[PDB]
Design a protein around this ligand. Sequence first.
Ligand code: PSU
Ligand code: PSU
Ligand code: PSU
Ligand code: MN
Ligand code: MN
Ligand code: MN
Lengths: 305, 306, 306
Amino acid sequence: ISPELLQISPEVQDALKNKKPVVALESTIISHGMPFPQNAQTAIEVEETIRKQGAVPATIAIIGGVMKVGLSKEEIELLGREGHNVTKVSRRDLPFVVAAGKNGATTVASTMIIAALAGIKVFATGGIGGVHRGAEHTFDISADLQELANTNVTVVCAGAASILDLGLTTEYLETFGVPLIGYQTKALPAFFCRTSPFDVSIRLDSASEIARAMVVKWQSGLNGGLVVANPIPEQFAMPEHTINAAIDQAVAEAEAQGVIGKESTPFLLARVAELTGGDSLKSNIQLVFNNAILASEIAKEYQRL
Amino acid sequence: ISPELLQISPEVQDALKNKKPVVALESTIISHGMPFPQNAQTAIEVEETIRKQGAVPATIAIIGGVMKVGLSKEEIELLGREGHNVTKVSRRDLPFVVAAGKNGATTVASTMIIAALAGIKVFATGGIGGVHRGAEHTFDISADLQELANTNVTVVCAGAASILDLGLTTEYLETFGVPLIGYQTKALPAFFCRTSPFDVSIRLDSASEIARAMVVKWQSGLNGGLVVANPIPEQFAMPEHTINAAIDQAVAEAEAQGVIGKESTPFLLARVAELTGGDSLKSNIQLVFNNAILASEIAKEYQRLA
Amino acid sequence: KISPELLQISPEVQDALKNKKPVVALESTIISHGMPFPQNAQTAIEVEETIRKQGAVPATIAIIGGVMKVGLSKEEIELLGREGHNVTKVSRRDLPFVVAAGKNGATTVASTMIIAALAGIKVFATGGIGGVHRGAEHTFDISADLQELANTNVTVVCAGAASILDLGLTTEYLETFGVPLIGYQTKALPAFFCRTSPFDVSIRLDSASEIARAMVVKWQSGLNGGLVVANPIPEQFAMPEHTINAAIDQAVAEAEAQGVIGKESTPFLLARVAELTGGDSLKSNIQLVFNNAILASEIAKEYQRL
Ligand SMILES: O=c1[nH]cc([C@@H]2O[C@H](COP(=O)(O)O)[C@@H](O)[C@H]2O)c(=O)[nH]1
Ligand SMILES: O=c1[nH]cc([C@@H]2O[C@H](COP(=O)(O)O)[C@@H](O)[C@H]2O)c(=O)[nH]1
Ligand SMILES: O=c1[nH]cc([C@@H]2O[C@H](COP(=O)(O)O)[C@@H](O)[C@H]2O)c(=O)[nH]1
Ligand SMILES: [Mn+2]
Ligand SMILES: [Mn+2]
Ligand SMILES: [Mn+2]
């Protein structure tokens, strides 16, 4: 509530009061999900994509201890340039970055929280956190899934990469009552891959259906979010053997180097990019754009209802 | 909630207005838990069982996109005849069946949600969903358990069959703060069987004690449901070895055949029925009636206090 | 507005809350099931006095004759101590039944957090929290304490937990559920008898003041749930690493061999470790409790200030 705690930029506030569609964006993908310059370049361009769809982007982050909804170009570039030097902020991290007046890059979890505080129901990203490979033994399970269990926001992603255990993730989502919606797909998108061995909970072929389902869900009091898994355009999909070989190697190296906890995902994405000579990153960028277009349509349709 | 979203039948409305005890019933048991004709026959008979006990049944389902509390005989017959062609609806499914104007059969989870929307505190079923065998590696855990964790409804069941991992299920219920009440039993009733190797969290010998505990729990702000595990009547209990052999075989076949997700429980129950020559189904019917009788008493004692 | 039949706050605690004086909650399972008599009672009363010396008001919580009591008389503390295992161990799933049945009960970290929250007390000192058990990846044995920390707004000051638990899995679980794990002046998670474990808290904070500010921001931002503050035992009282880990490993092996499960696990393990260390582990436990009460008092002061 307090302006000391939370600030929405004039553009976003205008859109909100005047009821234009707003699409939220996270910052961990910037600071920890991609290298500089590509991170900031992509963040700025995803905002522009949203605007060209006739919606209003709101990139969320913690700036100087303030939860910020909508960011300046300079702030986005700050997060990008600072990179790993900025705190990665999940639900358990959030109060401390705010209290200490520091900068932080918000994960899907923290971005969902802040968007919900701002009354934004639609959030685009590249991929969600989830159940990690070996989590049956390690218990390494993203707080993103608990946020999806509880917070009312639709998250548009490409599913997630096979760095995660996608099967266990689909089971987990069912247990916690979270819809996993395939956009024009029955198969659950694998991020770099358009398909995977696993299926979504329901296939929906239009943004309008998704928006209507959101309305029914929250009107009926079923709190929690919705995952929309949107397959990467075929043109930008990684070759399967290449990408799965790269992922399997990165996971092995992560194990050997003792990479654990919040350091896992940043480490893995960076290493896969390295092993594919940048191709995986270019794919990530395209899937982010695609997700922002779909998210724009969902937000439009939702505002209309 | 909009009339379009949620409709409570006049009988149930009057019952709630007039402070008469009401017992919710689910619909997944009808469409996916039992074959036709037995499915609709049982659903109608369980309603009558509740009325004979002096309570008012409310069967819950989604009909033409509307969440319905209390159903016509024709709607129940529909759910029974259509069977698997009706969508099985858990928490993650509910919004879409409603939005798309379709019919759906609600699981313990969805039925709890809807019952709670209507102010109904007592729900009779056959067996609850739970932790599946192998869940330590598959993560297959019923959304029913999360609903029990969070939604204010007492669910009367026979425990659950050993198609599930009952040990893991008892641990899960404890972690999530959910009472597992044995009605006149310390051993946890294993559906077809009156006992199992596992324990309920507390034994209570009267519906009155159960109702008192419900009132205290919710007046203390401890949100979430309660499981009442009620052993199948002695006449209908199945001999351990035959039934467990059938269950173990059905589980092994489901694993070999790659049966997963929401298809698992229906597959397992149908197969155990096939392997037992229909006996397991006859027992399932009887434990459902028994649960409706007890649930009727719990509802009566609960309404007495509230 | 909870009924006085269910919940009673002692006049001293009521006055403290009304006068904005810092209050520090204390649990009772540690008394009945966590320590032997007389040591359990003596420690409970002494820790109250510690808190008084630090300028705060202690509130020990328990269920007495069916009433959730916030603040306890010396006699009630002595009763719980003397009765020991005859007093019911009360977690979230137990709570409604001991209250409804008018019985005595000793409240775990989970129940104590619940009642503290009902009273509006934000700071709770204890010895160690429940958590993920060794083998929980197979057994699913995970303390309801962790779900209470996920959801209920109370800071719990502890020594971490002993290696009877799986501390690694516990740190993962806390992350998934959004619960801050604060090391007090330490990055490494304290292991109860041990100052340091081969694990890292989520954040190190060096002062009560920082902790209180974080509490304020967390709850004003609407992130409901608790915070764990893991405070290393003073060096003077720490147990020798090899001796204590040998004792713990033996106790765990014996518990598994004897089929000790569920709510009986932790009390059995702590008792056995105390036996195997000839009482030294208990003396350590007592000292870490006192240390935690001191830090908790400072956090309570700073919180009330803010
Ligand atoms: O392909 C990606 N997946 C996930 C992330 C980020 O990592 C977070 C998950 O991290 P963890 O589960 O450690 O909290 C996501 O919410 C998102 O911010 C990312 O940058 N790129
Ligand atoms: O003996 C039975 N157990 C469970 C069911 C149904 O199956 C649901 C659990 O399915 P799932 O875990 O797949 O959501 C229960 O809530 C109930 O509706 C049933 O029909 N028969
Ligand atoms: O060193 C200890 N750890 C934990 C306990 C008690 O055990 C409870 C956890 O037991 P369970 O997980 O079985 O609910 C804690 O909340 C606390 O009351 C204790 O006495 N001593
Ligand atoms: Mn993780
Ligand atoms: Mn399942
Ligand atoms: Mn346990």
